[PDB]
Amino acid sequence: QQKKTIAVVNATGRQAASLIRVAAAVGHHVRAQVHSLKGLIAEELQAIPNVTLFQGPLLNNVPLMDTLFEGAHLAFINTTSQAGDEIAIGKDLADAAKRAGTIQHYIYSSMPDHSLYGPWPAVPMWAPKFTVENYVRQLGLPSTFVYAGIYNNNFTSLPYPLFQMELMPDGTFEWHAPFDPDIPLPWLDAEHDVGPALLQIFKDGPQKWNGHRIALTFETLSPVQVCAAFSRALNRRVTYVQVPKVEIKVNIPVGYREQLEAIEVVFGEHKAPYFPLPEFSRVTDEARKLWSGWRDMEEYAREVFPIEEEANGLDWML
Amino acid sequence: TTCTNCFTQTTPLWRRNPEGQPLCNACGLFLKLHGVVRPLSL
Numbered sequence: 276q277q278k279k280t281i282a283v284v285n286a287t288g289r290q291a292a293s294l295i296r297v298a299a300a301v302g303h304h305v306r307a308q309v310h311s312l313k314g315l316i317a318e319e320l321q322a323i324p325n326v327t328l329f330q331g332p333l334l335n336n337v338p339l340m341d342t343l344f345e346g347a348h349l350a351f352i353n354t355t356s357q358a359g360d361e362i363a364i365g366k367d368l369a370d371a372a373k374r375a376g377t378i379q380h381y382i383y384s385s386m387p388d389h390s391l392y393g394p395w396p397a398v399p400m401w402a403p404k405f406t407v408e409n410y411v412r413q414l415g416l417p418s419t420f421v422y423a424g425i426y427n428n429n430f431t432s433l434p435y436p437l438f439q440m441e442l443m444p445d446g447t448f449e450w451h452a453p454f455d456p457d458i459p460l461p462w463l464d465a466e467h468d469v470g471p472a473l474l475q476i477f478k479d480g481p482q483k484w485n486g487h488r489i490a491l492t493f494e495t496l497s498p499v500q501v502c503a504a505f506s507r508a509l510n511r512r513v514t515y516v517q518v519p520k521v522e523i524k525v526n527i528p529v530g531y532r533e534q535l536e537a538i539e540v541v542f543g544e545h546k547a548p549y550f551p552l553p554e555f556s557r558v559t560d561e562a563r564k565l566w567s568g569w570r571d572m573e574e575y576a577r578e579v580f581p582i583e584e585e586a587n588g589l590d591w592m593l
Numbered sequence: 594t595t596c597t598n599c600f601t602q603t604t605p606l607w608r609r610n611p612e613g614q615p616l617c618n619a620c621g622l623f624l625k626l627h628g629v630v631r632p633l634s635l
């Protein structure tokens with residue numbers, strides 16, 4: 276019934292930002308943690324009426340944590356590797372929340388530890404989340420865990436790793452990745468659908484979702500289909516090319532390099548499932564039930580892709 | 594048609610706000626469930 280106060284971290288991130296916009300819009304209060312006020316998103320969120328930001332780091336920063344949870348009834352926690360030890364952080368947060376004693380529903384955004392379901396390696400920026408999940412369960416916090424599918428908007432024609440929808444000279448598009456071209460992958464439209472879904476989960480309470488793992492994915496497509504989709508929207512020739520290794524056309528920091536290396540092995544070498552969890556091995560059923568106004572690849576490719584490019588400074592849409 | 598909120602032109606099902614005005618599945622659904630117009634980035 277009544278709207279609550281939600282604590283969120285990494286406010287500028289695609290998952291948080293999505294929730295924040297929708298949460299504030301319907302009447303909820305938002306206490307959010309941002310690493311910096313400088314930035315488009317930052318200023319945007321800074322602008323939304325019932326949003327209160329706290330600028331500071333999460334690593335070894337319990338003071339902020341305590342503040343953030345003051346008067347909070349809900350929480351959507353989704354960290355990044357850019358902030359430091361994601362487990363020391365994810366643990367402190369969960370401790371903060373418990374100390375607050377007012378959290379009714381604590382949704383943590385989790386990811387698989389592939390080395391636990393096969394002879395595979397632990398993907399560097401996913402596996403640590405799984406450890407924090409268990410810790411949340413351990414504290415007994417009324418929680419629900421979400422596993423986000425890969426973002427439709429990771430795509431860009433720019434020289435960024437793994438998800439480059441490259442604009443060939445002849446005006447065609449090509450996507451080169453280690454992923455099998457025939458194997459469906461779990462997709463998700465972060466900006467468009469994370470907010471609405473998390474809202475609906477909160478709207479349901481731990482009475483329904485406590486202890487549950489939910490796959491935040493609204494559609495499954497194989498690389499070839501992804502391309503068939505971009506090709507459907509832009510009315511151009513988009514073709515997929517399976518490459519043994521991830522192409523790194525620019526300078527990237529270690530963590531992302533190691534991350535990609537693991538990805539090469541797990542998806543390229545071992546042809547493994549994005550969600551190696553027995554429960555996630557349709558996976559889109561629950562997600563679609565929670566939010567049925569999701570945005571598929573076709574609409575993304577057509578309606579958003581072009582725009583995002585444009586903003587990034589490109590011009591083939593003109 | 595085009596959505597009056599997000600202005601998309603790609604949607605699985607078209608909707609009508611309390612004014613018969615054209616909304617997309619998302620915008621229309623969000624409004625219906627929460628009471629306010631779907632908030633858009635930017």
Ligand SMILES: NC(=O)c1ccc[n+]([C@@H]2O[C@H](COP(=O)([O-])OP(=O)(O)OC[C@H]3O[C@@H](n4cnc5c(N)ncnc54)[C@H](OP(=O)(O)O)[C@@H]3O)[C@@H](O)[C@H]2O)c1
Nearest residue numbers: 287288289290291310314354355357358400423424425426
């Ligand atoms: N992309 C996918 O397909 C996918 C799928 C499943 C899970 N994930 C997970 O999503 C998590 C990331 O969350 P997200 O997608 O919501 O974020 P995101 O949109 O990828 O954005 C990354 C964020 O970190 C902030 N940041 C940059 N430098 C930082 C620093 N030094 N310290 C602290 N924060 C810093 C950025 O803020 P500013 O812009 O303000 O600098 C930005 O909001 C990752 O753990 C990833 O594994 C991604």
Ligand SMILES: [Zn+2]
Nearest residue numbers: 596599617620
């Ligand atoms: Zn719309």
